[PDB]
Amino acid sequence: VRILGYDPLASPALLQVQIPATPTSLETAKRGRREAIDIITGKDDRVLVIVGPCSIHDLEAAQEYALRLKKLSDELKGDLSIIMRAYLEKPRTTVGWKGLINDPDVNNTFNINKGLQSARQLFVNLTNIGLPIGSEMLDTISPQYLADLVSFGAIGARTTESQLHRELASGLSFPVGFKNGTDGTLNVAVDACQAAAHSHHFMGVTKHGVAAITTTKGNEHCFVILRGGKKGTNYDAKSVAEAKAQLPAGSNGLMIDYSHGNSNKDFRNQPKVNDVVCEQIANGENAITGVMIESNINEGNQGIPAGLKYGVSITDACIGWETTEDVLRKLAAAVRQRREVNK
Amino acid sequence: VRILGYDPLASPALLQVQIPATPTSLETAKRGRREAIDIITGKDDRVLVIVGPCSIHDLEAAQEYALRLKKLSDELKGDLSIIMRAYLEKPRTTVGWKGLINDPDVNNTFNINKGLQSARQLFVNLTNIGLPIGSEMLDTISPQYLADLVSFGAIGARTTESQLHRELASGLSFPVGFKNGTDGTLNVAVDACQAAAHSHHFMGVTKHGVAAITTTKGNEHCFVILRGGKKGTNYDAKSVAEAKAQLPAGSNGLMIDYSHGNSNKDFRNQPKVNDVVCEQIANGENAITGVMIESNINEGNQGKYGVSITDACIGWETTEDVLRKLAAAVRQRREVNK
Ligand SMILES: [Co+2]
Ligand SMILES: [Co+2]
């Protein structure tokens, strides 16, 4: 009675054959995962950086943003391990555009088959230039379509407490960042990381598009992402120390989100969070092993009226490209100074 | 590299044929929905009560509890519409027993096919005696197995913020209560009711067990459940006034959970919460239209028959006293409203 209808869906295995990953795409995803692992588990002293748009609505602009980011990654690879944000799924406050899978046409036609094709084509195009990607793992079905492409998964502030997303994370073959909750408190992420580290058994969709009982192995590469919230921002040295005091033995290093609840409603604050983070890093802070940045070709955002401006987010406001380059070069400087401190 | 394997799963349609609902089961589930709807939308001045075990681990014990509750429910029906907590799925802080469906043998062997069979035979056995049942809709696939037997579903405090659960709610055939968040504020529940009231498009599993694109109609029978949290309890008149101030036009009445956050880690606080909620109702508070109670045959919990293996519950005799007091308050609110 509250189901209007059911529309047929291509299976993951079918889409995978229709839109094959190239050798370079696969190698790139596996390398992004290796690097990310070595960073969050303390083998490598670079910083892991998840940077790029709040969301992708335009494959072409995303390809342009990706070329510029790959060129900067090649320059800064001694110091930073860069993964593009290629976020396909957007959790809303109430209602609103959910991303490129859900409504690729951004006009309320909900052509999900075309979204999945667009998403997977997008993921092959990005990783095919040797730039690893990451996305929020919001949907528990869509990762079957995409995950051979993905080097980093986030669980959002609004789904960190959810048992289903913890279950999902325990069966993903790549590192997973759990956001702290929207109230700004870290306990729920730390609990999520503990839960996701265990084996889970749950009903899930397989590559053939049918439900089966899944057993996961447990994901030892989950870590906490600090992204502020109601109680205040949490990127400063005191908030970090407070976070370090509640991590259990076995913990991975922390990531700091410059945007969202750490930006205080203003994308112009991302560079000021960077200054504070860099000062911690440059001074010896080893527990901060990653950062996340909402960056686009151009700054700010816009409403949805294809009468959209090029390279401008239609979800959260982003810093523009030239500011991103400043931010990243500053962070790379900071990473270098930390090595001096560590000797 | 992180999937240990897949085991075959009976489809929803198959289990519905193997464990068919009786005509009484079906009619009972329908009636429970009608009654819950009339109360939360203000058409009926009785209070809707979701009461029973924190979780079901024992079918026979649950039946015995259900027979007692059905008899109390007959006594008090002029004043309360009662739905049994038949909770199959338990969200954990980190890890631990997830309920009857996930691990019916409660010993880490996870026979989900037997858990779904036990769950469905349970839901049939309870509704077949004319008692409606409610459960937390934690798993988004599960409901395909059991929906047709359910009169109330809960989205729990740890999932009210989750877009997948708002989507799920938006396509459920029955009223849904969203708990406030574990920090104790209700904004996220208010946001969820707004979200679930809209039509959604999303990948879902159908009755023949394959993934398809679902379009829902949107669920206008969603309401907030007050269940306390880190910021404090929220069952008192100030909390209720603050809650009513937050509600949009077109809102349904509020439900107050006596337990979880509102019990401050002590199941013996449920009867005190009851007295506070009773005072408000008796004195004319018309926005409180629901309550939720964790109740079992015997009180407490454990890590022993008729005793919860999850959260601590009040026992059957206390349960009687609580609901008869609630019924009286409903009567007094009627007088106030004349
Ligand atoms: Co954003
Ligand atoms: Co409970």
Q: Whose structure tokens read 């036990």?
A: B118
In 3D, which of A100, A116, A90, A109 has the Cα closest to residue A11? A116
Chain A hits for B195, Cβ within 8 Å: 92, 94-95
The answer to whether the Cα torsion of B158, A291, A176, A54 is positive or negative is positive
Token pair recorded at residue B108: 């880490």
Length of chain A, please? 343
DSSP lists the bridge partners of residue A319 as A295
* CA angle in degrees (0–180, nearest 5) for A162-A168-A173: 145
Sheet of A211-216: strand order equals A201-205, A211-216, B3-7
CA distance A12 to chain B (A): 10
Q: By the 8 A CB rule, do A126 and A63 touch?
A: yes
User: Which residues sit opposite A80 in a β-bridge?
Assistant: A47
- CA distance to A327, B23, B156, per residue, from B148 (Å): 55, 12, 20
Q: With both helix axes pointing from N to C terminus, report the angle between B270-282 and B316-337 in degrees, rounded to the nearest 10.
A: 10
Q: How many domains is chain B built from?
A: 1
Spatial distance between the Cα atoms of B2 and A150, rounded to a whole number of angstroms: 14
Interface test with B, best of A203, A207, A315 (most B CBs within 10 A): A203
Name the nearest CA neighbour of A56 among A88, A26, A31.
A88
Judge whether A129 and A149 are in contact, CB under 8 Å: no
- Decide if B210 and A211 are in contact by the 8 Å CB cutoff: yes
- Among A1, A2, A160, A201, the residue to mutate for chain B (most B Cβ within 10 A): A2
| Cα B162 to averaged position of ligand 2 atoms, centre (Å) | 20
In the sheet with B201-205, reading across from the earlier edge strand, the strands are: A3-7, B211-216, B201-205
Nearest to A191 among B4, B94, B141 (CB): B94
User: What tokens does B321 get?
Assistant: 């006293």
- Residue in A93, A188, A213 nearest the CB of B112: A213
Specify the resolution in Å. Answer: 2.0
Q: Closest Cα to residue B226, out of B198, B247, B249, B250?
A: B247
Instruction: Give CA–CA dist B144/B168, Å, rounded.
Output: 11
Using the beta-carbon criterion (under 8 Å), do B93 and A201 form an inter-chain contact? Answer: no
Residue at A158: amino acid letter:
R
Rounded distance from Cα A52 to ligand 1 centre (Å): 10
- As a three-state string, the secondary structure of chain B is CCEEEEECCCCHHHHHHHCCCCHHHHHHHHHHHHHHHHHHCCCCCCEEEEEECCCCCCHHHHHHHHHHHHHHHHHHCCCEEEEEECCCCCCCCCCCCCCCCCCCCCCCCCCHHHHHHHHHHHHHHHHCCCCCEEEECCCCCCHHHHHHHCCEEEECCCCCCCHHHHHHHHCCCCCEEEECCCCCCCHHHHHHHHHHCCCCEEEEECCCCEEEEEEECCCCCEEEEECCCCCCCCCCHHHHHHHHHHCCCCCCCEEEECCHHHHCCCHHHHHHHHHHHHHHHHCCCCCEEEEEEEECCCCEECCCCCCECCCCEECHHHHHHHHHHHHHHHHHHHHHHC
Nearest-CA neighbor of B322 among B285, B286, B269? B269
**CA–CA distance from A69 to each of A63, A65, A205, A223, A258 (Å)?**
10, 6, 34, 24, 18
Q: Count of residues for chain B?
A: 338
| Record: contact A7-B215, CB cut-off 8 A | yes
Method by which this entry was solved: X-ray
Q: What tokens does A203 get?
A: 């009903």
- Whether the CB-CB separation of B154 and B139 falls below 8 Å is answered with no
For residue A316, give the nearest of A233, A277, A258 by alpha carbon.
Answer: A258
**A211 and B9: CB-CB below 8 Å?**
yes
Q: How open is the CA angle A275-A278-A283, to the nearest 5 degrees?
A: 125
Q: What backbone torsions phi and psi does residue A342 show, to the nearest 5 degrees?
A: -70, -20
Judged by DSSP in three states, A200 sits in coil
Please name the amino acid found at residue A275.
Answer: D
Judge contact between B47 and B326, C-beta under 8 A. yes
Nearest-CB residue to A9 (from B199, B212, B215): B212
The amino acid at B217: K
CATH number of the domain that A293 lies in? 3.20.20.70
Distance of residue A149 Cα from the nearest chain B Cα, in angstroms: 14
- Provide the domain limits for residue A158: 1-343
Token pair of B285, please? 């508070």
Ligand 2 centroid, distance to A109 Cα (angstroms) = 40
Give the H/E segment covering residue A83.
strand A80-85
B102 contacts on A by Cβ (under 8 Å): 201-202
* B15 CB-near residues (< 8 Å, 6+ apart): B116, B117, B120, B145
